[PDB]
Amino acid sequence: GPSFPEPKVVRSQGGLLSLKLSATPTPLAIAGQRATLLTYGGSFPGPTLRVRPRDTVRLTLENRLPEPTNLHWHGLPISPKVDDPFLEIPPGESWTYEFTVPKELAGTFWYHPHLHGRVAPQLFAGLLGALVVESSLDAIPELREAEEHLLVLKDLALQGGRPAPHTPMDWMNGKEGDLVLVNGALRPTLVAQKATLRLRLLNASNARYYRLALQDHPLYLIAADGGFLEEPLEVSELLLAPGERAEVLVRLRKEGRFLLQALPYDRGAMGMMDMGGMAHAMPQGPSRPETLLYLIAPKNPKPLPLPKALSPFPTLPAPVVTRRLVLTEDMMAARFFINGQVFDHRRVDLKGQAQTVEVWEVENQGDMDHPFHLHVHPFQVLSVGGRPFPYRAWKDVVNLKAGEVARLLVPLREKGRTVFHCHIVEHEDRGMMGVLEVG
Amino acid sequence: GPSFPEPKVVRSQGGLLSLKLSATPTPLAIAGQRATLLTYGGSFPGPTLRVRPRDTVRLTLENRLPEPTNLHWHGLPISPKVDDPFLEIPPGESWTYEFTVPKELAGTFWYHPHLHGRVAPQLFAGLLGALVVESSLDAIPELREAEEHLLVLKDLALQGGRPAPHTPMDWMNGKEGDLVLVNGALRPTLVAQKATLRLRLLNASNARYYRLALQDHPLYLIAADGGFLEEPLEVSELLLAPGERAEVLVRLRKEGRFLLQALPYDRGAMGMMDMGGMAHAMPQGPSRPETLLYLIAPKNPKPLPLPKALSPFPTLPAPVVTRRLVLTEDMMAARFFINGQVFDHRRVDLKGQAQTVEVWEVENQGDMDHPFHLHVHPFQVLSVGGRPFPYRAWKDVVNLKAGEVARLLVPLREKGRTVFHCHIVEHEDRGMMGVLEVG
Ligand SMILES: [Cu+2]
Ligand SMILES: [Cu+2]
Ligand SMILES: [Cu+2]
Ligand SMILES: [Cu+2]
Ligand SMILES: [Cu+2]
Ligand SMILES: [Cu+2]
Ligand code: NA
Ligand code: NA
Numbered sequence: 001g002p003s004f005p006e007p008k009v010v011r012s013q014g015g016l017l018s019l020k021l022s023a024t025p026t027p028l029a030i031a032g033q034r035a036t037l038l039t040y041g042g043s044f045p046g047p048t049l050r051v052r053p054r055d056t057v058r059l060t061l062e063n064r065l066p067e068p069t070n071l072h073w074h075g076l077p078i079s080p081k082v083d084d085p086f087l088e089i090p091p092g093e094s095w096t097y098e099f100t101v102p103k104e105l106a107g108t109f110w111y112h113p114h115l116h117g118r119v120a121p122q123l124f125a126g127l128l129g130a131l132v133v134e135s136s137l138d139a140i141p142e143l144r145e146a147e148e149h150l151l152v153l154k155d156l157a158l159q160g161g162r163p164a165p166h167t168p169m170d171w172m173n174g175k176e177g178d179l180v181l182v183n184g185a186l187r188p189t190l191v192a193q194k195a196t197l198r199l200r201l202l203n204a205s206n207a208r209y210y211r212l213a214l215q216d217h218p219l220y221l222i223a224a225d226g227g228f229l230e231e232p233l234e235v236s237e238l239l240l241a242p243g244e245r246a247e248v249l250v251r252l253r254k255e256g257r258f259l260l261q262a263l264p265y266d267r268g269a270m271g272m273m274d275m276g277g278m279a280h281a282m283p284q285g286p287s288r289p290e291t292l293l294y295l296i297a298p299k300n301p302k303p304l305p306l307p308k309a310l311s312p313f314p315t316l317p318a319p320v321v322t323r324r325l326v327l328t329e330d331m332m333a334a335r336f337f338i339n340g341q342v343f344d345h346r347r348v349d350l351k352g353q354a355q356t357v358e359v360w361e362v363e364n365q366g367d368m369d370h371p372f373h374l375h376v377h378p379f380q381v382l383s384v385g386g387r388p389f390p391y392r393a394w395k396d397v398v399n400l401k402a403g404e405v406a407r408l409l410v411p412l413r414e415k416g417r418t419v420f421h422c423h424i425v426e427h428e429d430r431g432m433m434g435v436l437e438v439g
Numbered sequence: 440g441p442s443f444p445e446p447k448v449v450r451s452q453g454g455l456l457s458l459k460l461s462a463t464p465t466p467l468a469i470a471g472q473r474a475t476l477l478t479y480g481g482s483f484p485g486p487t488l489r490v491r492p493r494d495t496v497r498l499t500l501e502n503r504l505p506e507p508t509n510l511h512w513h514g515l516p517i518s519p520k521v522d523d524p525f526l527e528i529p530p531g532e533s534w535t536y537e538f539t540v541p542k543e544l545a546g547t548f549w550y551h552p553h554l555h556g557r558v559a560p561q562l563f564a565g566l567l568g569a570l571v572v573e574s575s576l577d578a579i580p581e582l583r584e585a586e587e588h589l590l591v592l593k594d595l596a597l598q599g600g601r602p603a604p605h606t607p608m609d610w611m612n613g614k615e616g617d618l619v620l621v622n623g624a625l626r627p628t629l630v631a632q633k634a635t636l637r638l639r640l641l642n643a644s645n646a647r648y649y650r651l652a653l654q655d656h657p658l659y660l661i662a663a664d665g666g667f668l669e670e671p672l673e674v675s676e677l678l679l680a681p682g683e684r685a686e687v688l689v690r691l692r693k694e695g696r697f698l699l700q701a702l703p704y705d706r707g708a709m710g711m712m713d714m715g716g717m718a719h720a721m722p723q724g725p726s727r728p729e730t731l732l733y734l735i736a737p738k739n740p741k742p743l744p745l746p747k748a749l750s751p752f753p754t755l756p757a758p759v760v761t762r763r764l765v766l767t768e769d770m771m772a773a774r775f776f777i778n779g780q781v782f783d784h785r786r787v788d789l790k791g792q793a794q795t796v797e798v799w800e801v802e803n804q805g806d807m808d809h810p811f812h813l814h815v816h817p818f819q820v821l822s823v824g825g826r827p828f829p830y831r832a833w834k835d836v837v838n839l840k841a842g843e844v845a846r847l848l849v850p851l852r853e854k855g856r857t858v859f860h861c862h863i864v865e866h867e868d869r870g871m872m873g874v875l876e877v878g
Contacts, residue, residue: 169713169715176715271712271713271714271715271717272712272713273710273711273712273713273721274608274710274711274712275710275723276608276615276710276723278710282712284714284715
């Protein structure tokens with residue numbers, strides 16, 4: 001096929017995307033080896049759903065797993081009665097998700113399981129796929145003429161032809177795998193045909209971070225998790241935490257082969273050592289560098305000019321409340337807390353008013369990085385670690401290094417009960433999740 | 440008492456040192472705490488025996504321990520029928536060691552248990568003491584006028600008022616303790632009354648190395664394990680491996696306080712870590728620096744001149760055989776080998792001829808330092824690691840770093856069966872010992 005593997009795309013037809021997926025154990029060829037993964041739609045990653053604003057999505061999920069499951073429409077500002085984090089689909093049963101794509105929306109989103117206590121093994125085993133909301137902005141020449149690709153970054157570890165099981169240390173750190181894949185392929189080659197590439201990036205890993213850098217090139221950030229920036233932002237590298245998305249333009253500068261790498265990054269994962277007294281926890285330190293793909297530039301590349309503007313960011317009403325949410329850890333117990341409590345699905349932690357704006361101050365008092373995710377209500381990151389954010393865009397995951405405070409501007413949209421949690425999904429499964437009720 | 444603690448001295452009287460020692464569990468005050476140690480003569484260290492050449496030593500060892508024991512007269516070139524490594528003294532029984540001190544002998548020696556499989560816990564618990572052979576060379580003015588002190592370097596760890604037990608890792612590495620003591624005292628102060636000090640140094644530790652350095656001063660080496668050098672040798676530091684002895688002159692250069700330190704040294708001890716895959720062995724790295732004692736110099740110190748000569752080293756006959764003895768390790772089993780075999784007291788490994796000279800090439804093919812010790816027959820170290828030795832003196836322990844070959848000139852003296860072994864005594868207990876028969 002193409003030298004660059006990408007998930008099959010399913011497009012809405014006449015304003016309707018109607019599709020039956022099955023979550024199923026699936027024999028696959030993966031990275032040169034045969035393995036049985038848990039997949040949506042028979043593939044790893046699952047199919048990319050491509051829709052436009054105001055489309056109707058009608059997705060029937062058939063559960064062919066031996067355990068219950070559900071879907072989280074990660075990043076979509078839809079009703080928590082559709083994107084229902086408490087729903088359980090029993091083995092053999094089906095459930096239809098039906099919603100309308102919001103009118104003021106664009107970007108790369110994704111879908112994956114969200115059944116508390118079972119997310120990490122199900123996501124690690126292969127249950128994920130992308131959703132793209134196309135925009136009228138995609139027609140401006142500087143983007144229309146770019147070569148577009150989706151990059152699903154997800155790692156894996158195999159044992160006996162199946163996803164490796166979680167160890168106790170995996171529940172503490174979040175599980176990372178040795179197979180560092182792009183769209184399920186090991187170090188694919190992207191042979192560019194145009195000098196400007198538009199790359200949609202998705203970190204669908206349980207816990208691995210991707211400190212992205214393209215050899216000899218900057219990246220031009222044009223979209224964050226849930227929407228466009230106001231104008232492109234030049235960066236030398238781009239850290240993508242679990243659950244985050246971005247879209248970048250790449251302007252190929254000369255002929256040649258350029259590595260896209262995940263550079264060394266220390267997220268605070270911990271090991272154990274015994275040096276006499278002991279045993280006690282010790283930092284794992286930075287990740288080893290990984291090559292994600294090989295990028296081959298065309299002959300005599302002449303990249304397009306960058307767009308001068310993208311989409312203006314909405315002016316938000318003045319906020320009506322400030323919240324403080326402190327993250328802490330008990331690493332040796334693999335227990336994780338928000339304001340000193342673990343998740344309880346019966347307990348409402350925050351009560352807010354629809355169509356008001358809130359300021360959320362999320363403080364990481366742990367030693368690990370924690371990527372904080374809020375369902376249903378995209379937010380504007382004002383600052384992290386006391387540094388102002390260099391752009392305005394909708395996000396739904398924000399990474400906090402040890403000790404850092406993020407200040408978020410959170411407009412409350414749809415009414416109902418939803419959740420916020422760490423998107424190191426092992427930590428969510430082990431308690432680092434709370435309940436927000438909007439009325 | 441004196442600001443500088445030293446073991447009580449027992450001197451020969453009229454050419455006879457006749458003494459009854461008991462090896463006994465003993466309540467002591469040690470480093471500010473009460474503890475029960477295993478001691479000779481009720482003290483830790485045991486009493487220093489001080490003799491002259493041709494003295495008769497008659498030492499009755501009474502075993503009041505709950506397990507068998509014996510004595511090794513470490514470094515003395517006497518008969519292996521007296522210095523008997525295979526003898527067992529049962530609990531409650533006594534044995535008299537009787538020997539004549541050789542005529543051509545001088546230096547610092549020591550005594551400790553040597554019952555195979557039980558040495559490490561008995562030595563660690565406190566069973567050791569020094570023996571000094573006085574020399575007519577001690578009357579030359581440059582030594583007679585020096586202030587003489589014995590420094591027994593031995594570390595300890597206490598648990599519940601008793602020596603800490605050996606762990607599996609202790610059997611692999613050799614046990615080191617957190618209490619780093621001199622003559623059983625924690626960081627004593629030596630208030631010098633003379634500007635020249637003569638320090639007898641003994642490493643009586645199971646496994647700890649002492650990379651000795653005196654702040655702002657060199658050391659003048661005048662004797663190795665088993666005798667004087669030919670002339671003093673200036674050194675900036677002096678590594679003392681387990682079982683080694685040295686004598687140094689210190690020439691105090693000005694008033695003040697000077698630390699005698701055990702500087703960081705990496706002997707190849709190993710720990711265990713678990714960082715995801717794992718678990719696997721990892722180097723412990725260098726030891727942490729320790730202060731051994733505080734040295735206070737007198738006012739306006741005017742040190743004596745160094746002696747120009749000490750004792751000429753004997754011219755040895757040409758050697759008649761070359762031996763090769765390869766040291767290897769199985770760290771995870773805590774098994775240690777010489778030429779691929781573990782100790783067997785029934786098996787003779789080398790057979791040599793009395794009054795001939797042999798060349799022994801001892802090769803460390805392990806990753807840890809191993810201090811190689813030969814009973815009964817002191818040797819001349821020719822080279823280690825391919826570097827010629829910078830002095831001629833009798834030694835009976837030679838340290839080998841990983842990969843190093845030591846070339847030794849070994850005159851065979853007394854007839855009989857004796858042993859050679861690593862003086863990390865845990866390694867001896869775990870097999871790194873062989874049998875030499877001299878006829
Ligand atoms: Cu998600
Ligand atoms: Cu969630
Ligand atoms: Cu977390
Ligand atoms: Cu010894
Ligand atoms: Cu021995
Ligand atoms: Cu050894
Ligand atoms: Na299927
Ligand atoms: Na006693």
